[PDB]
Amino acid sequence: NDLSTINECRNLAKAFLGNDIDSEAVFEKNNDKANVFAIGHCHIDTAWLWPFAETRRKIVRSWATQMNIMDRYPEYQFVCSQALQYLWLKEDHPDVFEKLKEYVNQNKFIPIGGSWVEHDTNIPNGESLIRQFLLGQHFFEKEFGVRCRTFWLPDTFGYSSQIPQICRLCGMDRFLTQKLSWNNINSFPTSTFNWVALDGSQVICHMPPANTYTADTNVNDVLHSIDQHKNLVNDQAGLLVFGIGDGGGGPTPEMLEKLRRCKGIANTVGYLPNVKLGNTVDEFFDGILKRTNAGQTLPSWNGELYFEFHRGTYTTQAELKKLMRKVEIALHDAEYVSTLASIFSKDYSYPKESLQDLWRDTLLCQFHDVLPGSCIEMVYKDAIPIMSKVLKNTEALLWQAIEQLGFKKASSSDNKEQLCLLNTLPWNVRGVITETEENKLVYFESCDGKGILTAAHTSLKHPAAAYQKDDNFILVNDHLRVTIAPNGLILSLFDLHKEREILDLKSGKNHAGANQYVLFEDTPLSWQAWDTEVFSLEKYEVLDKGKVSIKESGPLRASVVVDIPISELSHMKATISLEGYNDCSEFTGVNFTCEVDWHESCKFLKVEFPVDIHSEFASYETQFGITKRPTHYNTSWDVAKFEVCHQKFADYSDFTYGVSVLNDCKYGFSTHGNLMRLSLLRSPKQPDAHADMGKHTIRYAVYPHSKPLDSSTVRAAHKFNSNFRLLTRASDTANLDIFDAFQLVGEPNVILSHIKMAEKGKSIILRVYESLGGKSRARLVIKSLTVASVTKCNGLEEDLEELCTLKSNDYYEVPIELRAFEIATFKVNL
């Protein structure tokens, strides 16, 4: 009933908060020894529980709020990561974007992240990550004048082992993430460390000690931002990231008032840590690097940051992952043949706009929620069509470029003598067996060129043969012999050169054949489409009610077919095939193709192979390298790795022999004590009522080799995943095989991953990377060209050093030297 009491209550309060809380002068007192650094953040999941059309509005409705708040509170600074969101805001509201870039120039509203979207770092291939950084940094350098030095990735469900190197290539030597505080098994050892990649490249990584990037500037948030720092001996500074994220507006203004009062408390009664608001994230990391002598003292983490959570994310939404890998490979082929056509042809302009839009629409569907399969049905009814459209447009672009080169499609009417095969792999695939028009197996061999494989009229030197021994089906070959039980389980996988069995059905728990299909009751704990739990393996059902039939016994590809009844409403048909070959290089192993009518509810269909290999670790393939996981469940850090992510092949080799499992749609593997288990299909229900119900085509090959993991396995994986398009010569005057223009002659572990045209100039960008782990040397052979120079550029294609290019008879043979797991990039100026 009296309003002067309010003011004298405020005066009574000023004995605890101080006199400056009403203005922005609280942050000017004691701004030297600051422990908690506060920054405003607005994490908007591009498509998590709402379509993209809703985020197009969430972006503006949050950022305009932030503009007005930054207008009211002068000390407040704001960060937002994705550049795609900036593009959407400029497409919808151009004037709001003009005011936004005005704020950006005024040192508020810091654009951070330097990537296109906040992508997942496990599933997309390495070139996808490099494209993320390329597109994001080019957008930021174009619109604003900033090049982000801080990789912002607080919501990703697991980090690959090569991310620090990719960051160092694209100019970003910092890293910020928060998700690794959700480890329900192993609290991460540090909070500010040096994340060292597979090869040695390092980024100064920091995790906000408060386990949320959506803090509330409370007293306990400000406290935990320094007091929960897991390694305080190295550096006493934690970042406070306050806001309301996961698809919502940023920090409310009352959070800024609570921050002012927290700083006032720290000034007057010094218990709360000294919050500092007028500092960005780059200044924060610069302080961290200054106080630790350029990070030379902080702990190191060498390799993969394993996120011990959201492990079913590798297997859920299987069709989207299949489409993503097909689209990545098709984009590789598209810009490869487009680079060739723009190089050689005279009136063909490299499709920069078409390929740029295709890459944008591919990277959009690599969001850390869309790709790992953690969205609602509408998000996927939006993402599968745009992804299929990207695939179709990439095929159309490839065909336009190819026809400009002098070829055309197979059309199923040209004679078998006039059929060719486009390779696009940077080495000579000795032979490829493929169907043309009527499941007709045709073999394509190329003894001379690595680009175009001609058909083979002569028979095979080493043909396959599917016959039947006593109630058993034998796919015999020159190399392997697959003895298959009458119920589908491979009773034996014998190697004919090295006379040894590769199964070990006696020991271990798996006692009945390899290629065993198992249905695990999934039933995760909390998040159904995200998580799969370690206790899901105790409840299982083995599918042993199949029936085997000899599908084909021809010389090119022997194959049996097993009709396995999964349950009622669910069925599967596994084709087990062994191909013939001329050279051992051509062989890809025992192929398996599952046609799964999948309708089970909360089930996990996996396939197991006991492999008679006794090693202590298994080599899986990740972006631009090889990650070696344990196989023994020794410590809690190994019990968390009961299912891991792998790109194309999972290897398991002892000193003398080894077994790889290659695939082209699956991403989750588990090797643990002689038993390799590939996770085929999940059936979650919580965010998606019908997640993977339907028909699925799952291809995977068991490729046994007679040495530790060699380049032969990498090449067999790339061949298994590649798409071989049937060509036909259009003109006998331009049908020349120029696809051998860019070669990489040297050690076979050095893969010429990607060929591209420059983002700005007319030079050819070659992404090379050693894939197995040894400092190697090679030679870029540029045959049918006149090379003005060959420089070594970084990921964003700025030159660093100029290579000394030789000059042979007609080619050039640039000599290159790659480190342990280096990802080098070469700009060839013609």
Binding site: L49, E54, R57, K58, A64, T65, I244, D246, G247, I376
Partner: protein
Amino acid sequence: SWATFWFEVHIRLPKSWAKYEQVIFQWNCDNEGLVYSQDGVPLQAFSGSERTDFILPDSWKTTEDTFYIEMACNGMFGTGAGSQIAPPDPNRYFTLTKA
């Protein structure tokens, strides 16, 4: 759910508010909304009960003006139908509680 509504809001402050240096418009429908001015410039968002106040920008308190609210019928995390990670509710009717 996901249905959009457009509220043209026409306000007239009482004259006695020549005082009251700050005037607020409160909007607390359980969903998202975004204030547009007469020209289409977004000014402030409403997100459930955690963000309601919209300060009238010291310019259209003197003269009775109008703005617009593009209210989207969904929570901050979609619709849910039982929980946040549950499949969205095709029918979730929101109630306007404060204007």
